[PDB]
């Protein structure tokens, strides 16, 4: 690993600099190096890891969608034949996206999840596992599509089970997990009713627990609750 010679603390320091510079590929490579030191990650470090890969894969997904839309248009009636280039380049971007997803899933499997015993760390990593299987599912069209979808569902479900047992309904990780699992139901699993039910129940249960929070925790929770409401508004 190219980061094998760099101190763990230096990798973390550089990940933070990369974030400030909006250099998310570098940020992800630094955090990968930090994970591969083999020590557990603190809360702040888990956030750096997630932020870096979310931003790298988010850019890839946006580009994939642009290319997929052009490719779809090419296969409509009366569209002029322009050769294999659009498919080839969509495939190139797709393969790079899959690679990044496989890299994140590999970090989670070797060995972040197995060493994560506290509810906050284990739920956070399982949410990530669901997320990266969901991104794999978005581009899957083959024999394994059902298994990729099921892997996303399974990770999200284990995270939900732990979160409901161990965390308050306003916890930002519980909220963010539910938000994303609801989107999985709507966009991936063809289950819009399940998506709407989950977003509503999560929002309402959080509402009822806001009274227990400090001002700062209230701000943190309500920010994510608004996204649940935004999705509900989109869907109804």
């Amino acid at each position: 690993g190219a980061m094998g010679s760099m101190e763990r603390a230096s990798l973390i320091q550089k990940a933070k600099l990369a974030e400030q510079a909006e250099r998310y590929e570098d940020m992800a490579a630094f955090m990968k190096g930090a994970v591969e030191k083999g020590e557990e990650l603190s809360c702040e470090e888990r956030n750096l890891l997630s932020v870096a890969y979310k931003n790298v894969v988010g850019g890839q997904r946006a580009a994939w969608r642009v290319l997929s839309s052009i490719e779809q248009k090419s296969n409509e009636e009366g569209s002029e034949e322009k050769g294999p280039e659009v498919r080839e380049y969509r495939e190139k971007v797709e393969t790079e996206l899959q690679g990044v997803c496989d890299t994140v899933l590999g970090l989670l499997d070797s060995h972040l999840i197995k060493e994560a015993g506290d509810a906050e760390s284990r739920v956070f990593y399982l949410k990530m596992k669901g997320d990266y299987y969901r991104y794999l599912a978005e581009v899957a069209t083959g024999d394994d599509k059902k298994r990729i979808i099921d892997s996303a569902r399974s990770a999200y479900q284990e995270a939900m089970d732990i979160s409901k047992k161990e965390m308050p309904p306003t916890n930002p990780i519980r909220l963010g997990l539910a938000l994303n699992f609801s989107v999985f139901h709507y966009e991936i699993a063809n289950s819009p009713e399940e998506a709407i039910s989950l977003a509503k129940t999560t929002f309402d249960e959080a509402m009822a627990d806001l009274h227990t929070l400090s001002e700062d925790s209230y701000k943190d929770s309500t920010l994510i609750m608004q996204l649940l409401r935004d999705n509900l508004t989109l869907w109804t």
Binding site: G176, L179, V183, I224, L227, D230, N231, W235
Partner: peptide, 5 residues
Amino acid sequence: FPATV
């Protein structure tokens, strides 16, 4: 697209 975090 819907919101995720």
